[PDB]
Scaffold this active site. Sequence first.
Site: not given
Ligand SMILES: CC(C)(COP(=O)(O)OP(=O)(O)OC[C@H]1O[C@@H](n2cnc3c(N)ncnc32)[C@H](O)[C@@H]1OP(=O)(O)O)[C@@H](O)C(=O)NCCC(=O)NCCS
Lengths: 364, 368
Positions: A149, A312, A342
């Site tokens: 990114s 993506d 992404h």
């Molecule tokens: C961490 C990440 C990068 C990828 O990880 P992932 O395996 O896809 O994880 P998920 O987001 O799908 O799910 C994990 C979280 O969602 C939460 N979650 C899932 N379903 C939920 C729901 N129905 N209600 C509330 N929270 C929920 C989980 O509790 C967990 O929380 P935590 O952060 O305390 O552990 C992404 O999840 C994130 O946090 N941000 C992405 C955006 C980003 O970083 N952009 C900048 C780079 S370009």
Amino acid sequence: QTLPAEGEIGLIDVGSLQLESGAVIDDVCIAVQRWGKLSPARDNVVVVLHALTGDSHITGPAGPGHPTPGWWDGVAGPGAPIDTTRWCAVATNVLGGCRGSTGPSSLARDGKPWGSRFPLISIRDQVQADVAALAALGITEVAAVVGGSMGGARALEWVVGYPDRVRAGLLLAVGARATADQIGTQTTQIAAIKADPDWQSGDYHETGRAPDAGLRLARRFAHLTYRGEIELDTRFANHNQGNEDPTAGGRYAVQSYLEHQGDKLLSRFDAGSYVILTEALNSHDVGRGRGGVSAALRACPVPVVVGGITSDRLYPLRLQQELADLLPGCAGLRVVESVYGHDGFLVETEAVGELIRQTLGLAD
Amino acid sequence: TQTLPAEGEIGLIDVGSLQLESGAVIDDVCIAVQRWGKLSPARDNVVVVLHALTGDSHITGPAGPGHPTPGWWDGVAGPGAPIDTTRWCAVATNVLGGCRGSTGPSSLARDGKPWGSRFPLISIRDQVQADVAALAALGITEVAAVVGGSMGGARALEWVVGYPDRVRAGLLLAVGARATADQIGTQTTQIAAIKADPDWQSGDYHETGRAPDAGLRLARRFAHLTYRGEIELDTRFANHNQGNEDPTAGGRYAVQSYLEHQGDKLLSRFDAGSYVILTEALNSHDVGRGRGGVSAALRACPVPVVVGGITSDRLYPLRLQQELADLLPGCAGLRVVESVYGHDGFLVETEAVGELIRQTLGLADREG
Ligand SMILES: CC(C)(COP(=O)(O)OP(=O)(O)OC[C@H]1O[C@@H](n2cnc3c(N)ncnc32)[C@H](O)[C@@H]1OP(=O)(O)O)[C@@H](O)C(=O)NCCC(=O)NCCS
Ligand SMILES: CC(C)(COP(=O)(O)OP(=O)(O)OC[C@H]1O[C@@H](n2cnc3c(N)ncnc32)[C@H](O)[C@@H]1OP(=O)(O)O)[C@@H](O)C(=O)NCCC(=O)NCCS
């Protein structure tokens, strides 16, 4: 200046920096963290460039000083993609950020936060700060630069603007320039933060009120562009959150998931940095002042590995295909299979590990 | 007696009090309607046209008194048009909860002041009950076909499934069996963007001189993005600046100026309250609710239908139309429309959408 203790945080003063626009921001500090052991020749530096809301904490558990663990937890260490037994993983907080480096929330000379007075920066300004930060430590050339990114855009301006100060680069989920779709959603994300009453023209710092509502809105909309359409439906569908009723005050599963995603950002990110860094993304363009995108890429000899994610939605695969075709140092597009859109370059541990390991081989 | 309005005019049909699916009651419901073409002798040529989220009964025609903008399907109904008015009677209504004619948040209730925060949430099935009640109020109990896209497609879907014996055919464009997670995600957040506006005033802003213009504009700009195609936008605007403005010095980008104009354009013809009420009817869209699931409900609907989807649709991806086509026995197969304009293609590709409408009307003829 010397590198910070392996793992600990460190500040690198690079002095005044003249930006591409002509503005001059002085007394610029750049936070940095390093994993690995610097070589006697200072020639094994692998610079990891973070994305929009990332910082220098690329790997390691959470706890004191780090609310959340690293965004690439496990990418640096013995036997890891960036083998710290022979590589020096150096990560910095981008210029304009809010995790130690100079940004809108930092204080200026008048003893008060930069705020609305912070100058608009570009991806090339963020790179000049990183390069200057490394120079302050006696490092002129680095072995490789890797990022996704914004980190990918930073790694693209590093290999094109300073081809002789880097031996190889990994460009992950990025394009040669900003696209209309990216600018459209990002300029509207900015308008969401700026429409919050507590934005206060960007000088909300140290007033008690911040644009929390606007920041959550921007993050929720952005998180959708980070994920894959099918992955969301398969995982959340139209189900309700637990036993709630969306008809009478409840929420949908995906709705509860997005609110949490925005809450995680409020507790660690600053709205001013979200605006300044997003405006830098919009200005991304490797062909500006270089004779167009094609010319700038054809004239870049640095060996690079280009990776793109199939699902993506924010940086479609077509953008990485363009980069690989035009960069002479790139054999061909290196597709990363992933259903998480992404966020694929953050979740596909093994797939991204292979691209990093291929990038360090070219540095050798 | 309640009669249809003259061709080109608007009519306000009263349907009395309606009881919603949730149990709530809406009193003195008023549904605006427009017609095109004469009724046939047996009154069997009624083609119901169901508009999308921000649409109204002005399906075709130029701008004039009471219609600032031409119809969203300019040219879809008329002599020799897809809905050939020499044979069919094009009847279009303003959806329940709309701000553009029918009863909605902005309309005055019995106490004298607007509904506002007092307007109960409605489902797609509630909007269908109102339209069917409107036709019944006039005297129409059976229509030849229902056609629509997006929310218009959702309304058409719940019509053929809920009243299979009172409709002969249907056209489902750019819609799915139920709301998806990506759709509910952006649509709930759009609602949140309107409610975060300090002028929302819990929805009771109508008679205060203040209105959540900031929120509505934000919700529209994000929604318009989901309506277009990725490649379309980049080819059209790329990263170009808007005129002589310079983003480096606080200027706007070309696509930025374009999105802003879309918000303002909707801002002056639409009500934020209706946007919220209708956006949440989309969220509740689920043809399987109370029917044993999506597959069971569609498997049991025998009405012949034509299902079409846009290749570059980013809000209602082609896989959604493909599923509808596979689960409805009355569909012969998915019809794919090749467009670069994303979800908006069902409004732009008037030639490709025109044929699907002609195929739908052909099924209505055969079934009559
Ligand atoms: C961490 C990440 C990068 C990828 O990880 P992932 O395996 O896809 O994880 P998920 O987001 O799908 O799910 C994990 C979280 O969602 C939460 N979650 C899932 N379903 C939920 C729901 N129905 N209600 C509330 N929270 C929920 C989980 O509790 C967990 O929380 P935590 O952060 O305390 O552990 C992404 O999840 C994130 O946090 N941000 C992405 C955006 C980003 O970083 N952009 C900048 C780079 S370009
Ligand atoms: C009607 C509609 C489909 C028009 O699509 P289109 O024919 O492909 O043309 P566009 O709207 O994309 O562009 C033309 C308009 O944008 C304006 N525009 C174009 N470039 C612009 C720019 N760079 N800056 C500002 N405005 C710009 C044009 O001046 C024109 O303005 P106008 O609305 O007064 O005519 C749609 O854009 C619209 O206005 N409403 C659709 C409502 C809706 O809900 N659609 C989805 C179904 S729910």
